[PDB]
Ligand binder design. Structure first.
Ligand SMILES: *[C@@H]1O[C@H](CO)[C@@H](O[C@@H]2O[C@H](CO)[C@@H](O)[C@H](O)[C@H]2NC(C)=O)[C@H](O)[C@H]1NC(C)=O
Ligand SMILES: *[C@@H]1O[C@H](CO)[C@@H](O[C@@H]2O[C@H](CO)[C@@H](O)[C@H](O)[C@H]2NC(C)=O)[C@H](O)[C@H]1NC(C)=O
Ligand SMILES: *[C@@H]1O[C@H](CO)[C@@H](O[C@@H]2O[C@H](CO)[C@@H](O)[C@H](O)[C@H]2NC(C)=O)[C@H](O)[C@H]1NC(C)=O
Ligand SMILES: *[C@@H]1O[C@H](CO)[C@@H](O[C@@H]2O[C@H](CO)[C@@H](O)[C@H](O)[C@H]2NC(C)=O)[C@H](O)[C@H]1NC(C)=O
Ligand SMILES: N[C@@H](Cc1c[nH]c2ccccc12)C(=O)O
Lengths: 469, 463
């Protein structure tokens, strides 16, 4: 109604110029569309490109879990693998990407001609039991690495006699266990092996000859850096767990120097972070440092290897009955029969579950945060100097979420003292960042924090999270 | 001078198919597995969503057959109730939810089309915005050109979506044929994180996202041949096919990937293509991108004929009613829709619109069903050839009440504010409808503006 009818509109709109105006607007619209397309093309072509993927393997995407004594993992009186088949849910909840069985072959004493590396010990389990355990582990996406140490009941790592026949037995057993379906091998205390470099190179070549996802772990007892480098001279791809970090504890910058020197000497390759080849963390640390080390090991460029029960701070010096080499796992008050009532809830795994502040909750959160971001998976690592008693570094892959870890190894509280951000690389440090979690009571998370006025209580770790700049 | 009926049965099915299957199948699996841990539970909730959509479409078909007036909820819910609720509905459609729908779908299209050029890197935001705006401009020009071109494009892109889904299904079947285990033991058995109200209702709420968009046939009624029989037939042909395709695609996804992979990754289709294809697995997002393109077109179509309908009732300015004498398309309505679709690009954030839509979309359907029941009670034999039993509508009303309760539980503060905006239309309603004897200068200015818009864009009144 509020407008011209058909006849009047066709009478008036036919005037010259009016026909040209709408045509001009149509051509202007098409020109603007073409200009928008050209601008989009220019923005696309003049843009940075992606970084190349590092060809991710299976063992780079999570920690590893070691089981030194299978009998004491589920308590005495139950040594069969069915305990592990039933307990796989616990490790799946922990979200580990590996599992290291202890030695299961026959080893009674130093008798070389009687010890065999292929036959499965009946007490530990059966061959079909091992196959069922492997199948269950594979279904749970938990891959199994099997240990091969011919002598673990006596004094020598391999045998006190000539070791060539030991190498022949090991090379015979490699395929027997490889076609069994295991996903990797482990050898320990190779410091007692004469000319161990050649044997390790041969085993690495053989294991890689079956498939590409096969892995080999070597464990030493020497903290010397030069010996480790000499061992890795011909075994670059080999993962070597050692006591390197065990030399010093609670050191503000000595630990940073150790880590930086090791990374510089190794050529920034992939390595394994652990305080000992087969021993627990509490055997070298007190109860006030477990959180700091568990935070450090989950944010370093490498594979972290932990011992069983060290996600809840198990102690081998708190109960006389349990031997130091084979601690008994604390599942309930009835787990340890001697002196009932000595076991407390806060050391019990069930007591550490519901409590948010428990070590087990911290371990679970770090495990969750380890295997989803690419920065912590295969990102670049840059450590920068800070105030005394502190260790500060940054993780950043190419463009994803950047992480910044600060640890206080000093015995007294002090400010952050971040001073100059040495080697920031592409990931510039902003004045504002998030705080995902803290290792001490207080310090509510989720809120942003200001770094220039960070007050650090003794023995505290921070895992600030900030995005691309 | 009236819009002749051009949509046929095939185009009627194509509209629904291209509107419903735009993005949900390629993203939702991750969320439904996050809520429902067991893949069997996810399949069960998908089937439940499918049958719920079947029930809603069934009754909706009758509701549309009874009232052959053009326009969707704005017509059925205007004939029932009164003028005031209808204007609130149309104002809400005009303000946020409808214009934001096209922009969000176009942004998804841009991102998934530019993904092959930036596999791991996040695509630049400027390029995505420009590509989305280019898509909207091209589509609103094609729509203004002629109806037949729009119908042909919609049919072609629906066919492309079906072809991509069939490719996914055949790849899944092939990988089943290679001695697969179908992940049967994790399937069903332990449910995982099931709860009475904690998780199953959340999984249902996530599932109903991908099944939306079936309420579009009404928006194009009075433009299709023989609406009395072709409208219900198109719905009953389209919906079960979509349900079975969704179920089969979810089954194909679950069997060939680990649960944790979906729980961690986002683009399930990209991972499927990388695993199976292994070669040139970059077109997969491209197809998916195309799967969005046609969708936008459909929405734009179903948007324009909505606003035009409002302009017939006097709620809207009379500029929108006029149509081109030769082309016979409502040019001003399409231009207005394109303008307010473009205007949402300038927003820094775009996910804030879901908070209100999430409950508005599911309360309006319940209001429409209550109106249908009221119409049945008030006067019988109002040309109801179908005459469905009065059992589905009451169950649908009860289910919609549960959905509204779940929405209130999930986002109380967000839902509150969303509804407050609804009250903002009252001053506009009073100024436009309740206020009529305006000063002469206002009427002169309005008339001059409409005359100018008629002079630039050659459009004649409806009659
Ligand atoms: C056996 O393992 C050794 C350990 O590096 C590999 O050394 C190779 O020796 C063979 C011939 O002696 C040649 O392939 C090269 O001289 C060496 N290549 C490399 C990469 O070291 C060897 O690859 C493995 N298998 C072979 C072919 O001997
Ligand atoms: C073996 O582990 C312990 C940890 O300190 C050390 O014991 C030495 O063992 C080697 C080989 O038997 C011998 O030198 C002596 O038995 C011990 N002497 C030393 C060095 O303390 C030793 O650090 C480790 N092995 C070496 C030599 O590094
Ligand atoms: C091990 O790395 C250190 C890094 O400090 C090397 O010491 C030098 O310091 C600069 C600064 O980082 C290094 O980039 C240079 O490579 C070294 N140059 C100087 C000033 O001596 C040390 O030389 C490295 N050792 C090896 C074997 O590369
Ligand atoms: C329980 O946690 C406490 C942490 O304080 C540790 O041992 C406790 O030590 C404090 C004082 O040093 C006292 O509460 C008790 O001596 C111990 N706790 C209790 C409740 O007895 C250790 O982590 C756990 N100790 C025990 C025995 O519960
Ligand atoms: N589900 C549609 C998206 C969609 C279109 N119209 C809708 C109305 C309400 C909710 C979702 C939609 C898709 O797959 O892309």
């Amino acid at each position: 109604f509020t407008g011209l009818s058909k006849e009047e509109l066709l009478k008036v709109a036919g005037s010259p110029g009016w026909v040209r105006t709408r045509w001009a607007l149509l051509l202007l619209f098409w020109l603007g569309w073409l200009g928008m397309l050209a601008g989009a093309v220019v923005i696309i072509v003049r843009a940075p490109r992606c970084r190349e993927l590092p060809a991710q393997k299976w063992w780079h995407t999570g920690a590893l879990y070691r089981i030194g004594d299978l009998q004491a993992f589920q308590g005495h009186g139950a040594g069969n693998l069915a305990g592990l088949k039933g307990r796989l849910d616990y490790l799946s909840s922990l979200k580990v990407k590996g599992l290291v069985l202890g030695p299961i072959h026959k080893n009674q004493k130093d008798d070389v001609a009687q010890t065999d590396l292929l036959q499965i010990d009946p007490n530990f389990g059966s061959k079909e039991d091992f196959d069922s355990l492997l199948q269950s582990a594979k279904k749970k996406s938990i891959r199994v690495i099997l240990d091969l140490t011919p002598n673990y009941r006596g004094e020598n790592s391999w045998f006190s006699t000539q070791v060539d026949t030991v190498a022949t037995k090991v090379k015979d057993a490699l395929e027997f266990w490889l076609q069994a379906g295991v996903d990797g091998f482990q050898v320990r205390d190779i410091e007692n092996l004469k000319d161990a470099s050649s044997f390790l190179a041969e085993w690495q070549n053989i294991t890689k000859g079956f498939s590409e996802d096969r892995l080999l772990i070597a464990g030493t007892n020497s903290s010397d850096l030069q010996q480790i480098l000499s061992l890795l001279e011909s075994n670059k791809d080999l993962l070597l767990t050692s006591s390197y970090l065990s030399d010093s504890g609670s050191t503000g910058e000595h630990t940073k120097s150790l880590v930086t020197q090791y990374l510089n000497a190794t050529g920034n390759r992939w390595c394994s972070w652990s305080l000992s080849q087969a021993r627990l963390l509490t055997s070298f640390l007190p109860a006030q440092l477990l959180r700091l080390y568990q935070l450090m090991l989950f944010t370093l460029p490498g594979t972290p290897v932990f011992s069983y029960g060290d996600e809840i701070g198990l102690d081998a010096a708190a109960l006389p009955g349990q031997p130091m080499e084979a601690p008994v796992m604390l599942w309930d008050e009835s787990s340890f029969p001697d002196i009932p009532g000595a076991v407390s809830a806060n050391m019990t795994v069930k007591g550490q579950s519901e409590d948010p502040g428990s070590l087990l909750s911290l371990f679970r959160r770090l495990s969750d945060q380890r295997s989803k971001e690419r920065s912590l998976l295969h990102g670049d690592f840059h450590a920068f100097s800070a105030g005394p008693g502190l260790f500060s570094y940054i993780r950043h892959w190419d463009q994803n979420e950047r992480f910044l870890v600060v640890l206080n190894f000093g015995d007294v509280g002090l400010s952050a003292g971040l001073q100059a951000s040495d080697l920031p690389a592409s990931a510039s440090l902003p004045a504002k960042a998030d705080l995902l979690l803290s290792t001490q009571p207080g310090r509510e998370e989720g809120s942003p924090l200001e770094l220039e006025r960070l007050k650090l209580e003794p023995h505290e770790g921070l895992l600030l999270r900030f995005p691309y700049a | 001078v009236t819009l002749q009926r051009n949509i046929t049965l095939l185009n009627g099915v194509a509209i629904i198919v291209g509107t419903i299957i735009g993005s949900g199948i390629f993203v939702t699996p991750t969320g439904v597995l996050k809520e429902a841990g067991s893949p069997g539970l996810a399949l069960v909730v998908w089937a439940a969503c499918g049958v719920f959509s079947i029930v809603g479409a069934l009754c909706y078909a009758e509701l549309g057959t009874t009232i052959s007036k053009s326009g969707g909820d704005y017509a059925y819910m205007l004939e029932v109730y009164g003028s005031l609720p209808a204007f609130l509905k149309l104002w809400i459609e005009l303000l946020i939810i409808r214009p934001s729908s096209q922009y969000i779908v176009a942004l998804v299209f841009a991102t998934y089309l530019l993904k092959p050029l930036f596999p791991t890197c996040p695509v630049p935001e400027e390029a995505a915005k420009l590509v989305a705006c280019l898509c909207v401009l091209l589509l609103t020009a094609v729509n203004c050109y002629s109806v037949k071109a729009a119908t042909r494009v919609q049919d072609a892109f629906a066919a492309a979506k079906l072809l991509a889904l069939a490719l996914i299904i055949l790849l899944g079947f092939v990988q089943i044929g290679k001695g697969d285990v179908s992940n049967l033991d994790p399937n069903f058995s332990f449910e995982g994180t099931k709860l009475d109200v904690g998780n199953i209702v959340l999984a249902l709420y996530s599932g109903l996202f991908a099944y939306g968009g079936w309420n579009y046939l009404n928006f194009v009624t009075e433009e299709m041949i023989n609406p009395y029989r072709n409208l219900p037939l198109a719905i009953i042909i389209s919906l079960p096919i979509v349900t079975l395709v969704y179920v089969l695609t979810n089954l194909a996804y679950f069997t060939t990937l680990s649960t944790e992979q979906m729980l961690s990754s986002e683009a399930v289709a990209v991972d499927f293509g990388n695993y199976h294809l292994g070669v040139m697995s970059w077109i997969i997002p491209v197809f998916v991108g195309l799967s969005c393109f046609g969708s936008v077109n459909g929405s734009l179509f179903t948007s324009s004929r909505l606003f035009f309908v409002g302009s017939r009732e006097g709620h809207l300015p009379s500029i929108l009613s006029m149509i081109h004498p030769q082309l016979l398309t409502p040019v001003p309505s399409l231009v207005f829709t394109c303008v307010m679709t473009l205007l949402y690009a300038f927003s820094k954030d775009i996910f804030s619109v879901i908070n209100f839509f999430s409950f508005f979309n599911w309360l309006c359907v319940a209001l429409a069903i209550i109106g249908m029941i009221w119409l049945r009670h008030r006067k019988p034999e109002l040309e109801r050839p179908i005459k469905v039993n009065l059992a589905l509508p009451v169950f649908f009303i009860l289910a919609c009440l549960f959905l509204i309760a779940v929405s209130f539980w999930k986002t109380p503060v967000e839902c509150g504010i969303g509804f407050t905006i609804i009250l903002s239309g009252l001053p506009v309603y009073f100024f436009g409808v309740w206020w009529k004897n305006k000063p002469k200068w206002l009427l002169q200015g309005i008339f001059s503006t409409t005359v100018l818009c008629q002079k630039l864009m050659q459009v004649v009144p409806q009659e």
